[PDB]
């Protein structure tokens, strides 16, 4: 219970569901996602995902509390989290270029958060695997230390490895069309196999890594900010437009020939290709991507 101890400052955005405000909790800046009684289901689902035992991780948005005022107003349901002044990765990459170190910090942090989300921990204080289903640069926040954290669990799915039960709402195609994996675009995805969701998140993470790498400046040389497929689909692409490029034409975002000249960009490009296979079962796992980027950061003396 926390809502009565928070002063709402200003609205900062609107999620898939709910409105996000910057607030102050006993002087500390917090983010508050507010929902009306009408979106009780989306509030309830996100609060449930956040309350998962052992989910806390520096690269997953820090949950503080969920509250219900039972007042019948637009401030009835609360989800209170940490506040990150920079906002999202999309805005960050539009404003700034990054150094090789900065790129590795953004990529490794995203992979670390997704590996934690995907990881099944067996025990008493155990953890079920979770898939995001809408990973994109607009759903990643940039912290003051230059690392990322994943947010917006409104479409997330939880697995029960014992009874094969998938906690899913809705049990159909969701997400941002631009970032949908080929198997999602062509309806071949096996919705009863939890691994399918993890594989689709990996494909989307590969597209986010391409967005970051384009902004990696070495001696002032870098690319302008673009969304994946900016050159191949119109703004707000339909499922048909995406299917033609991704499934039929087998196209992926172009990897600049100049990324082969830098070891960090070579490692990033190899990870992207191995996230992008049409065969989802051949893609890398988030844990393996995390450890590849961790080894590179360790050897190069990059500390997080």
Swiss-Prot record:
| Major subcellular location class | membrane
Q: Where is this cross-link: Glycyl lysine isopeptide (Lys-Gly) (interchain with G-Cter in SUMO)?
A: 192
Chain ranges of the Protein kinase domain: 6-296
Q: How does it sit in the membrane?
A: Single-pass type I membrane protein
Q: Which residues lie on this side of the membrane: Cytoplasmic?
A: 1-304
Name the catalysed reactions.
L-threonyl-[receptor-protein] + ATP = O-phospho-L-threonyl-[receptor-protein] + ADP + H(+); L-seryl-[receptor-protein] + ATP = O-phospho-L-seryl-[receptor-protein] + ADP + H(+)
Q: How does it assemble?
A: Homodimer; in the endoplasmic reticulum but also at the cell membrane. Heterohexamer; TGFB1, TGFB2 and TGFB3 homodimeric ligands assemble a functional receptor composed of two TGFBR1 and TGFBR2 heterodimers to form a ligand-receptor heterohexamer. The respective affinity of TGBRB1 and TGFBR2 for the ligands may modulate the kinetics of assembly of the receptor and may explain the different biological activities of TGFB1, TGFB2 and TGFB3.
Pathology noted in the record is:
Loeys-Dietz syndrome 1: An aortic aneurysm syndrome with widespread systemic involvement, characterized by arterial tortuosity and aneurysms, hypertelorism, and bifid uvula or cleft palate. Physical findings include prominent joint laxity, easy bruising, wide and atrophic scars, velvety and translucent skin with easily visible veins, spontaneous rupture of the spleen or bowel, and catastrophic complications of pregnancy, including rupture of the gravid uterus and the arteries, either during pregnancy or in the immediate postpartum period. Multiple self-healing squamous epithelioma: A disorder characterized by multiple skin tumors that undergo spontaneous regression. Tumors appear most often on sun-exposed regions, are locally invasive, and undergo spontaneous resolution over a period of months leaving pitted scars.
Can you say what this protein is called? TGF-beta receptor type-1
Shown portion of the whole protein?
A: 200 to 503 of 503
């Amino acid at each position: 219970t926390i809502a009565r101890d928070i002063v709402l400052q200003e609205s900062v955005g609107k999620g898939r569901f709910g409105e996000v405000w910057r607030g102050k909790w006993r002087g500390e800046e917090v983010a508050v996602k507010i929902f009306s009684s009408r979106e009780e289901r989306s509030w309830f689902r996100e609060a449930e995902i956040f309350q998962t035992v052992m989910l806390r991780h520096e690269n997953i948005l820090g949950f503080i509390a969920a509250d219900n005022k039972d007042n019948g107003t637009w401030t009835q349901l609360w989800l209170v989290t940490d506040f990150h002044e920079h906002g999202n990765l999309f805005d960050y990459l539009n404003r700034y270029t990054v150094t090789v170190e900065g790129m590795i910090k953004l990529a490794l942090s995203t992979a670390s958060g997704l590996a934690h989300l995907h990881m099944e921990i067996v025990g008493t204080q155990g953890k079920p695997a979770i898939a995001h289903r809408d990973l994109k640069s607009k759903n990643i926040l940039v912290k003051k230390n230059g690392t990322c954290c994943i947010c917006d669990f409104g479409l997330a799915v939880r697995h029960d490895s014992a009874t094969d039960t998938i906690d899913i709402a809705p049990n159909h195609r969701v997400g941002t069309k631009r970032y949908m994996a080929p198997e999602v675009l062509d309806d071949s995805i096996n919705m009863k196999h939890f691994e399918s969701f993890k594989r689709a998140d990996i494909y989307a993470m590969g597209l986010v890594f391409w967005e970051i790498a384009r902004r990696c400046s070495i001696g002032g040389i870098h690319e302008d900010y673009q969304l994946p497929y900016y050159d191949l689909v119109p703004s707000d692409p339909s499922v048909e437009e995406m299917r033609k490029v991704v499934c039929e034409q087998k196209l992926r975002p172009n990897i600049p020939n100049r990324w082969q000249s830098c070891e960090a960009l070579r490692v990033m490009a190899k990870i992207m290709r191995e996230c992008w296979y049409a065969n989802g079962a051949a893609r890398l796992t988030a844990l393996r991507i995390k450890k590849t980027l961790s080894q590179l950061s360790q050897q190069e003396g990059i500390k997080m």
